[PDB]
Design a protein around this ligand. Structure first.
Ligand code: HEM
Ligand code: HEM
Ligand code: HEM
Ligand code: HEM
Lengths: 184, 190, 184, 184
């Protein structure tokens, strides 16, 4: 998967303790790690059906800004990495390697690295306000996929809440290159 | 409620269209507005029980008390916790029952400045931790969303009712934090 | 100097803009900052003489209230901090650090923290009316010391007026814990 | 100066006595404190010239590790703090405040906080061996600047040796987060 750089990016300037504190704040515990891995099982085999809901109004950020035309090759390549992110979110251990890639992913929404990974000339920057807003649809979208394979509501809620915790935590990490020095 | 300034704050530097776009991004529709108002009914009469989970000076609040504290001594400011708790109590019902209009937007922006070094501590005249880091505001989206759901369900009803109320609350919390981030983010990055 | 906490106190609940507006109102400009620093030169070597005029209708507030007896220790320790305040007033940059200490000093006249710094059992509270009244003697007392080393009357007036501006500004800050919520 | 945190950092886990013993071992006495302050006079007005020799052999540690490309903003911001360190080394009183900042500076070479201050993704860790080796060039580089303004060789040697003592003492402090528990 071109540009997919999990495990191959530089050290994010967030410390291990600050990360641990962040996981504590979103209440990401051992239970959620289990629920996440279980979401990975439930979602593994529905990724394309998830991808069709999300990536294949914010089309604009996949576009050439001067013409407003979307970049097919940008959408395809990001979609593929997003497909991997679905399973990275569920199945990776949320360790320094994970933190570093989440930070990378945040830089790629940011003017710092947006468009660079796919070599496209695109909207340079995704405003923070939309990254945070997106927490809702990207959280809520997953839940029908978590439930389709049945099980217990407490299973579905545990998986769902763990996913929710991860999305928030990710966006919390991503905000670091968006926020003023000292305000993060 | 001292410091509670809903309807009495200055114009936030966010336009009406950017706000509307933000509500559209979190998918805050007329269904959610209805669900929010219905959460207001379900929650109004459980606020103190909600407040005890989140904010008091005899609450249950966790790794967060520090931001209610004197930084040099680490001691929490009882009067800060009580006054904020009262405003938080009103915020619960403001979140459910207010119309999400310019007046609302302006107060959400105010509330974000009050977590920010710009106005934290000023409202209660306390000498406190000057600034709540953005990372924690965003992280808090989860516990402040998830905490509400048992209270939405206690009075029974339909799961689709509870989910509608719950999701609307979720949308509001995200939208609020999205607004609050504006004084935290670099010029042009919001 | 025990209790002398310049640079080591918490954030006063006064904003940077409200402080700047306050300096604007007392007309504290770049000229006064220069004149203040020059007062610092003129006064540093007369502090003890200054202190003997001021601290070594006030005495009651240095006293045990039940017996009316003054607390030697309290007077000695405050005098020392006052000695430092003379030079802090002239030589510090009037920035957030300064503002925070002025606010601290106001709390120490207030029932909020009077007596705490020196661990004394004393008159709990200095009434605001006397803090404001004291603006005059604490301003006017300094002027002979500003003039003793000679120079130009315009020098002496510039130093004197800057000192006057600072004393007012300080008391203006101190009033915040004395005034009703919303009335400051 | 962004990130420049002298006087604003937490308590280093080195005691006052262990610090005093360290100054005793490098033979940092009252004479050196005087010589240091005199170096401060001699160097204050040559800092940029000094900075151009050192920071604007080990560029890699200012770099992105994956690409080896140096981070201009990292070099700029560190250079500015280094400029302040030159004058902090000469002019500060070597007290607890100073010790705490030296410890901070050592953590910033260490994997514990390297890159965090400037939010850069960089080489995570400066190996201890290079911190110690650097004692020589960072000591010897200063001496022509100490001599340029003339004076006595005994003046230049006193300033030079005091600088030498400080650099060693600093690195001695910095080694604490690098060394095994109990071996420092
Ligand atoms: C309104 C908000 C958002 C918009 C408009 C947006 C759009 C984009 C775009 C254009 C890219 C590719 C950026 C580049 O490298 O040039 C991208 C990458 C990605 N986004 Fe977003 N995004 C948003 C928020 C989010 C959120 C909250 C998540 C949650 C994780 C997310 C997940 C991803 C993933 C997984 C990728 C691919 C990352 C990779 O390269 O591995 N996005 N998104
Ligand atoms: C989604 C996240 C959050 C929500 C929904 C929320 C809600 C609120 C509300 C409603 C208020 C009072 C507003 C008013 O004065 O009218 C408030 C104030 C406050 N909250 Fe938060 N809060 C959040 C995050 C946080 C975090 C992470 C902390 C860290 C402990 C925190 C600590 C405080 C403090 C110290 C105040 C007093 C602020 C001040 O000095 O004015 N809050 N919060
Ligand atoms: C009638 C008016 C005043 C009375 C009775 C008074 C008395 C006192 C007392 C009892 C203290 C010790 C407070 C404590 O317990 O810490 C004190 C501290 C002090 N006062 Fe006043 N004061 C008055 C007005 C002023 C004014 C106008 C100034 C001008 C700046 C001033 C300057 C100071 C200073 C510098 C200190 C030491 C602050 C520190 O702790 O560093 N006072 N005064
Ligand atoms: C081979 C050895 C060294 C290398 C490769 C190196 C490189 C660096 C780097 C990359 C930084 C930025 C660190 C950060 O991310 O915060 C830095 C900061 C700094 N270095 Fe070194 N350094 C070395 C040894 C030394 C020595 C012996 C000194 C003597 C004091 C010194 C003085 C400084 C100073 C003063 C700063 C800025 C401290 C501050 O943030 O205030 N370095 N150096």
């Amino acid at each position: 998967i071109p540009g997919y750089d999990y495990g191959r990016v530089e050290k994010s300037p967030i410390t291990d303790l600050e990360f641990d504190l962040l996981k504590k704040t979103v209440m990401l515990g051992e239970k959620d790690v289990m629920y996440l891995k279980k979401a990975g099982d439930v979602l593994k085999d529905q990724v394309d059906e998830i991808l069709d809901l999300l990536v294949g109004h914010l089309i604009y950020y996949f576009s050439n800004p001067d013409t407003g035309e979307p970049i097919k090759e940008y959408l395809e390549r990001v979609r593929a990495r997003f497909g991997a992110w679905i399973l990275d979110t569920t199945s990776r251990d949320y360790n320094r390697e994970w933190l570093d890639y989440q930070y990378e992913v945040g830089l790629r929404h940011h003017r710092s690295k947006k468009g660079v990974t796919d070599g496209v000339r695109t909207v340079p920057h995704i405003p923070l306000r939309y990254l945070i807003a997106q927490i809702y649809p990207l959280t809520a979208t997953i839940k029908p996929f978590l439930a389709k394979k049945g099980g217990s509501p407490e299973d579905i809620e545990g998986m769902y809440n763990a996913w929710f915790k991860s999305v928030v935590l990710q966006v919390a990490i991503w905000s670091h290159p968006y926020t003023k020095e000292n305000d993060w």
